[PDB]
Design an enzyme around this catalytic site. Structure first.
Site, PDB file in Angstrom:
ATOM      1  N   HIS A  68       0.852   5.064  -7.381  1.00  0.00           N
ATOM      2  CA  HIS A  68       1.296   4.678  -8.734  1.00  0.00           C
ATOM      3  C   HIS A  68       1.270   3.116  -8.997  1.00  0.00           C
ATOM      4  O   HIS A  68       1.231   2.782 -10.129  1.00  0.00           O
ATOM      5  CB  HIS A  68       2.303   5.440  -9.409  1.00  0.00           C
ATOM      6  CG  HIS A  68       2.031   5.780 -10.866  1.00  0.00           C
ATOM      7  ND1 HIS A  68       2.567   6.853 -11.636  1.00  0.00           N
ATOM      8  CD2 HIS A  68       1.092   5.570 -11.798  1.00  0.00           C
ATOM      9  CE1 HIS A  68       2.087   7.140 -12.593  1.00  0.00           C
ATOM     10  NE2 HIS A  68       1.127   6.357 -12.804  1.00  0.00           N
ATOM     11  N   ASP A 122       4.810  11.674 -15.652  1.00  0.00           N
ATOM     12  CA  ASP A 122       5.420  11.690 -14.034  1.00  0.00           C
ATOM     13  C   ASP A 122       6.872  12.381 -14.157  1.00  0.00           C
ATOM     14  O   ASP A 122       7.417  12.360 -15.217  1.00  0.00           O
ATOM     15  CB  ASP A 122       5.483  10.109 -13.962  1.00  0.00           C
ATOM     16  CG  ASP A 122       5.638   9.558 -12.498  1.00  0.00           C
ATOM     17  OD1 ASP A 122       6.309  10.363 -11.726  1.00  0.00           O
ATOM     18  OD2 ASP A 122       4.997   8.737 -12.159  1.00  0.00           O
ATOM     19  N   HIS A 157       8.883  10.915 -12.559  1.00  0.00           N
ATOM     20  CA  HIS A 157       9.820   9.480 -12.590  1.00  0.00           C
ATOM     21  C   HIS A 157       9.369   8.616 -13.722  1.00  0.00           C
ATOM     22  O   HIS A 157       8.157   8.638 -14.181  1.00  0.00           O
ATOM     23  CB  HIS A 157       9.631   8.844 -11.174  1.00  0.00           C
ATOM     24  CG  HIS A 157       9.617   9.981 -10.088  1.00  0.00           C
ATOM     25  ND1 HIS A 157       8.405  10.380  -9.538  1.00  0.00           N
ATOM     26  CD2 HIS A 157      10.813  10.392  -9.359  1.00  0.00           C
ATOM     27  CE1 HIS A 157       8.762  11.139  -8.598  1.00  0.00           C
ATOM     28  NE2 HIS A 157       9.983  11.230  -8.545  1.00  0.00           N
ATOM     29  N   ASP A 163       9.151   5.333 -12.836  1.00  0.00           N
ATOM     30  CA  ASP A 163       8.604   3.994 -12.482  1.00  0.00           C
ATOM     31  C   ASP A 163       8.740   2.739 -13.080  1.00  0.00           C
ATOM     32  O   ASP A 163       8.016   2.144 -13.155  1.00  0.00           O
ATOM     33  CB  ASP A 163       7.150   4.155 -12.385  1.00  0.00           C
ATOM     34  CG  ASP A 163       6.771   5.563 -11.398  1.00  0.00           C
ATOM     35  OD1 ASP A 163       7.828   6.131 -10.762  1.00  0.00           O
ATOM     36  OD2 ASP A 163       5.562   5.772 -11.122  1.00  0.00           O
ATOM     37  N   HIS A 196       5.467   1.661  -5.995  1.00  0.00           N
ATOM     38  CA  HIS A 196       4.847   2.504  -6.837  1.00  0.00           C
ATOM     39  C   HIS A 196       5.948   3.117  -7.827  1.00  0.00           C
ATOM     40  O   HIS A 196       5.804   3.921  -8.723  1.00  0.00           O
ATOM     41  CB  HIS A 196       4.336   3.740  -5.995  1.00  0.00           C
ATOM     42  CG  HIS A 196       5.351   4.595  -5.475  1.00  0.00           C
ATOM     43  ND1 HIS A 196       5.025   5.907  -4.903  1.00  0.00           N
ATOM     44  CD2 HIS A 196       6.737   4.402  -5.153  1.00  0.00           C
ATOM     45  CE1 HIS A 196       6.270   6.510  -4.487  1.00  0.00           C
ATOM     46  NE2 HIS A 196       7.046   5.596  -4.716  1.00  0.00           N
ATOM     47  N   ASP A 217       0.776  10.940 -13.182  1.00  0.00           N
ATOM     48  CA  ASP A 217       1.225  10.989 -11.840  1.00  0.00           C
ATOM     49  C   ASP A 217       1.168  12.589 -11.505  1.00  0.00           C
ATOM     50  O   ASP A 217       1.615  13.306 -12.293  1.00  0.00           O
ATOM     51  CB  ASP A 217       2.574  10.509 -11.582  1.00  0.00           C
ATOM     52  CG  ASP A 217       2.989  10.709 -10.261  1.00  0.00           C
ATOM     53  OD1 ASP A 217       2.644  11.266  -9.346  1.00  0.00           O
ATOM     54  OD2 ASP A 217       4.265  10.155  -9.922  1.00  0.00           O
ATOM     55  N   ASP A 255       2.692  14.281  -9.558  1.00  0.00           N
ATOM     56  CA  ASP A 255       3.915  15.123  -9.187  1.00  0.00           C
ATOM     57  C   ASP A 255       4.835  15.309 -10.335  1.00  0.00           C
ATOM     58  O   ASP A 255       5.896  15.689 -10.558  1.00  0.00           O
ATOM     59  CB  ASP A 255       4.895  13.985  -8.147  1.00  0.00           C
ATOM     60  CG  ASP A 255       5.418  12.753  -9.002  1.00  0.00           C
ATOM     61  OD1 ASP A 255       5.701  11.699  -7.968  1.00  0.00           O
ATOM     62  OD2 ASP A 255       5.298  12.558  -9.912  1.00  0.00           O
ATOM     63  N   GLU A 301      -1.277   9.627  -7.074  1.00  0.00           N
ATOM     64  CA  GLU A 301      -0.348  10.404  -6.197  1.00  0.00           C
ATOM     65  C   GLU A 301      -0.707  11.452  -5.378  1.00  0.00           C
ATOM     66  O   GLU A 301      -0.109  12.313  -4.673  1.00  0.00           O
ATOM     67  CB  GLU A 301       1.014  10.346  -6.750  1.00  0.00           C
ATOM     68  CG  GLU A 301       1.705   9.242  -7.289  1.00  0.00           C
ATOM     69  CD  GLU A 301       2.019   8.050  -6.151  1.00  0.00           C
ATOM     70  OE1 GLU A 301       2.127   8.594  -5.070  1.00  0.00           O
ATOM     71  OE2 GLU A 301       2.533   7.126  -6.786  1.00  0.00           O
TER      72      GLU A 301
HETATM   73  N1  LIG Z   1       5.433   8.024  -8.395  1.00  0.00           N
HETATM   74  C1  LIG Z   1       6.596   7.810  -7.961  1.00  0.00           C
HETATM   75  N2  LIG Z   1       7.156   8.663  -7.029  1.00  0.00           N
HETATM   76  C2  LIG Z   1       8.380   8.099  -6.587  1.00  0.00           C
HETATM   77  C3  LIG Z   1       8.427   6.910  -7.491  1.00  0.00           C
HETATM   78  C4  LIG Z   1       9.821   6.070  -7.628  1.00  0.00           C
HETATM   79  C5  LIG Z   1      11.259   6.931  -7.263  1.00  0.00           C
HETATM   80  C6  LIG Z   1      12.315   6.099  -6.864  1.00  0.00           C
HETATM   81  N3  LIG Z   1      13.241   6.141  -8.055  1.00  0.00           N
HETATM   82  C7  LIG Z   1      12.132   4.759  -6.438  1.00  0.00           C
HETATM   83  O1  LIG Z   1      12.494   3.667  -7.121  1.00  0.00           O
HETATM   84  O2  LIG Z   1      11.525   4.437  -5.622  1.00  0.00           O
HETATM   85  N4  LIG Z   1       7.548   6.936  -8.441  1.00  0.00           N
HETATM   86 MN   LIG Z   2       4.647   7.407 -10.714  1.00  0.00          MN
HETATM   87 MN   LIG Z   3       6.190  10.426  -9.686  1.00  0.00          MN
END
Ligand SMILES: Nc1ncc(CC[C@H](N)C(=O)O)[nH]1
Ligand SMILES: [Mn+2]
Ligand SMILES: [Mn+2]
Ligand SMILES: Nc1ncc(CC[C@H](N)C(=O)O)[nH]1
Ligand SMILES: Nc1ncc(CC[C@H](N)C(=O)O)[nH]1
Ligand SMILES: [Mn+2]
Ligand SMILES: [Mn+2]
Ligand SMILES: [Mn+2]
Ligand SMILES: [Mn+2]
Lengths: 313, 313, 313
Positions: B96, B119, B121, B123, B136, B227, B229, B272
């Site tokens: 991402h 997502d 998250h 991000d 990402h 994303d 996920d 992702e």
């Molecule tokens: N797409 C996606 N999967 C995981 C993230 C980051 C999550 C975590 N808070 C970090 O800062 O790495 N982004």
């Molecule tokens: Mn993401």
């Molecule tokens: Mn994510």
């Protein structure tokens, strides 16, 4: 509720054969008894003996038309006979082509019926729009009056008389509809709730609108044609044409619990259960168990509980 | 709808490498053809050749900044090029972090864009708030104008110019947000629908508010950064950071079907997807199949069906 | 939030023994620490030592009454002790019979409490209505004042004093209720939301009505008795009496997140987790992980995120 069980071990409406065993495994799950365990008055009319029709070449692209046509004609008479005995016809299939005879025999006794079709498909292809030739995907085209004139004379169906208008049917669970079928939906103004609408409104509002759509004007007998692939394959995997993103077990029970509560259920079809397509013995029992649960819900079983009119304390 | 496919086999935005194969398996699933099978006009711009950057030590805690920075710069130009050819940019990732270049290149041609970020998250970590150092999980902090001044000069991103306000983005699907990220959400007044809101309102109301929030004032181009996920891992398991309790397959299709219907989709990211993280060959196909379905829905595929403007009878 | 942990390794309320290990595996999942990782002030009161009662023949059909009766009496005192130390009692079971002592000890300190019972069952059978004799399915009948006089003197429960009216409790998640239990529901006018209502209204409206039903008149302490089998067995399989079509992981988190937000949580029960009934090591961890998540949500963990009152930028 008062029931009339009819086994319809038929499969010539589609390519896969194991569906003929539907009546067998459902009865084996103890369906008759479990219904009786409830406030139900059950009478078993037996499994229809579908005699062989060795000579039955395709009609253009349409497969086993004489066999499918005869099985529905035979079934139509049985359903009409049980409806005359004052009982809710419970047809255990069998592929969905049998719906042609079930809804037909039902309408002979109750012409003002309303149909609720729970399926991942519309099953409204005509002999001319179908690309597969499998009649289990054409049952609705034979029943709609508006489509009379677009249905060629197929060997085995000369006995058919369209018995329902486009406005007397509601679809629930759609997620795999052919282009020509979609054209017919929009053209005849058929009421439907595909998975998109269920996701948008919720199963509660969906059922609210469904019953109001069919019972708004006046109360009338309800025919529930339930294709088990209408539910998600994680619940009913042993079926010929599974489509992901289906109705949940809970939504399936909600639908039927609501229909039961109207007290207008008149005809019921439990179709497409195919044991031989279960990748494991558990997928087979999972499908059957789910099919039985939906059936019991149609006749009274409520998730909140049930009790007899007596003082339990 | 008219599309411009761009493969972005990049992975340096996070630790796991298999994500670079995303473009490969999605194309292998027959994505191009299936889109064409629909009312789609497709032009493949190819897989961006992301040249190696051997010398790229961490910036403080931030990993592979030059590599991630260059890949987004390269991608930004490609997206702007496809947007100038009058086509919806479809970026197949890749992690991402590439969102930085995709939304950047998009805004160069359409500065009034609105972003929908599906997502698990947010991000939105900055180089200073991130605890993992994986870019990402920082793409959004580089794009927000309000965060300009809190983003240190990281090697590889001198070309970046914040192009979106906090009010021009909507999050959907959140369930794993860091403390600093949550602080930024509440501080900049960013509009979001975490899994809690989806559970409370339903995906229908969620989408209703989302589109009204972004298109209320005026109609504008929509950028969908999806994303995989964001959906529950039971649907998309082959992904680097799965979180249970995610959006269902149905909700995922509902989201995209609605975006499509606005006729304003302008940019799309499918990120992702990591095949090498599938515990089985089926988990890999399940993820890819779900990623393709969401993609097709973005360009017209409706669960109720589709038909050409012709008389099918 | 301020917590008072109480391990209740008891199983004599039902046939299967592995439930006594509930406290062990939940603590082993790092529950204490994870709570502390949050804004939580935790004090571990230990695992109640439930001494053996070798002589305990059935009371009519009721099994292990003295053992179950003593365990609840012991627990009632512990909960009252933690409520006097100004802490939210967190009872880790153990079968659900322990609810008798938990809600009892709670009411001693807070007689105006309101109960929310998340379970696939009502657990309101009396010693005379139960057909199984398992006390984990009778806890509620001992607590309701309206049922005083219908509860015979069972060895081990002479210390019990009904402490809640039928109108001070709300059921959520019902899908396996006995006939006599359903009679009591309708007879005492008990407020409940079975899976049918959750399907109809949505978990959001369900929680809205639940809290308004219990806090409408006035704000009061809330007791949450959570039976893990209230959730679908796909989430919590390692439990003695699983019932398909249960609350989802998301709904389970929604319920608890909302209760937390009222700031009125006073008592909490996490019951029926039985590790030995997991068909695999993963089913065991899946159950424990889900039980911990629901617990953390009760004390602050929000899916949208959490942050300390400080400037993160
Ligand atoms: N797409 C996606 N999967 C995981 C993230 C980051 C999550 C975590 N808070 C970090 O800062 O790495 N982004
Ligand atoms: Mn993401
Ligand atoms: Mn994510
Ligand atoms: N029950 C059921 N499963 C599949 C169908 C037909 C679907 C397809 N459009 C056809 O025309 O054969 N019907
Ligand atoms: N938690 C929990 N699982 C099962 C029960 C009792 C159900 C049954 N009606 C009985 O009377 O034993 N309670
Ligand atoms: Mn069908
Ligand atoms: Mn079907
Ligand atoms: Mn219980
Ligand atoms: Mn229970």
């Amino acid at each position: 509720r008062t029931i009339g069980i009819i086994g319809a071990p038929f499969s010539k409406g589609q390519p896969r054969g194991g569906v003929e065993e539907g009546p067998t495994v459902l009865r084996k799950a103890g369906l008759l008894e479990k219904l009786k365990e409830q406030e139900c008055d059950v009478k078993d009319y037996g499994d229809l003996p579908f005699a062989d029709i060795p000579n039955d070449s395709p009609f253009q692209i349409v497969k086993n038309p004489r066999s499918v046509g005869k099985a529905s004609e035979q079934l139509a008479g049985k359903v009409a006979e049980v409806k005359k005995n004052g009982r809710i016809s419970l047809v255990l299939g069998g592929d969905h082509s049998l719906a042609i005879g079930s809804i037909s025999g039902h309408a002979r006794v109750h012409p003002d019926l309303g149909v609720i079709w729970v399926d991942a498909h519309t099953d409204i292809n005509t002999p001319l729009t179908t690309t597969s030739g499998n009649l289990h995907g054409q049952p609705v085209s034979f029943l709609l009056k508006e489509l009379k004139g677009k249905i060629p004379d197929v060997p085995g169906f000369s006995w058919v008389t369209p018995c329902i208008s486009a406005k007397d049917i509601v679809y629930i669970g759609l997620r795999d509809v052919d282009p020509g079928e979609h054209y017919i939906l929009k053209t005849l103004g058929i009421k439907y709730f595909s998975m998109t609408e269920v996701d948008r409104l919720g199963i509660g509002k969906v059922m609210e609108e469904t019953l109001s759509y069919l019972l708004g004007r006046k109360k009338r007998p309800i025919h529930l044609s339930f294709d088990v692939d209408g539910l998600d394959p994680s619940f009913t995997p042993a079926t010929g044409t599974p489509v992901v993103g289906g109705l949940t077990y809970r939504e399936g029970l909600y639908i039927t619990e609501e229909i039961y509560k109207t007290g207008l259920l008149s005809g019921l079809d439990i179709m497409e259960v195919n044991p031989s397509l279960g990748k494991t013995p558990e997928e087979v029992t999972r499908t059957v168990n789910t099919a039985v649960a939906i059936t019991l819900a149609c006749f009274g079983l409520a998730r909140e509980g049930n009790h007899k009119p007596i003082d339990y304390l």
